[PDB]
UniProtKB/Swiss-Prot annotation, chain A:
It comes from Homo sapiens (Human). This is Angiostatin. The chain holds residues 185 to 262 of 810 of the full protein. The gene is PLG. Disulfide bonds join C3-C80, C24-C63, C52-C75. Residues 3-80 form the Kringle domain. It comes from the Eukaryota.
């Protein structure tokens, strides 16, 4: 589904853009932002490519931005 | 083998159970500064550069 029912916990959509208009960084990549959310570390969290996901159980699926002046941001995903 | 310490763990910690506890409180997500304190046992003696984690920054 491309939308969320609650907070997007089981959201396995293809949205890869933050609500700020920045393309999300690939989870499997550490450039330019280094993180500890390795797809192999959390394979049950659907950390595929650079799609916005919810690994910490936040209220909105987020992702890392591709800008050095922005660590991470939330993604504007619709609700079902 | 009680003496032979095998690498394979006997008990596997469940990550889902940790989520249910909510001990993280989204803190590790809000600020990664707490991770640095876990990585380094002690703080630097001189002025730490710190800076941001980037390729050109």
């Amino acid at each position: 589904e491309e939308c969320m029912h609650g907070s997007g916990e089981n959201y396995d959509g293809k949205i890869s853009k933050t609500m700020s208009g920045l393309e999300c960084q690939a989870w499997d990549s550490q450039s330019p932002h280094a993180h500890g959310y390795i797809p192999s570390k959390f394979p049950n969290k659907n950390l595929k490519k650079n799609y916005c996901r919810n690994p910490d159980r936040d209220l909105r699926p987020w992702c890392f931005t591709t800008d050095p002046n922005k660590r991470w941001e939330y993604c504007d995903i619709p609700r079902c | 083998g009680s003496k032979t310490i095998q690498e394979k763990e006997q008990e596997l910690k469940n990550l889902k159970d940790n989520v249910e506890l909510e001990r993280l409180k989204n803190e590790r997500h809000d600020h990664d500064e707490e991770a640095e304190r876990k990585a380094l046992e002690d703080k630097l003696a001189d002025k730490q550069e710190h800076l941001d984690g980037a390729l050109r920054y």
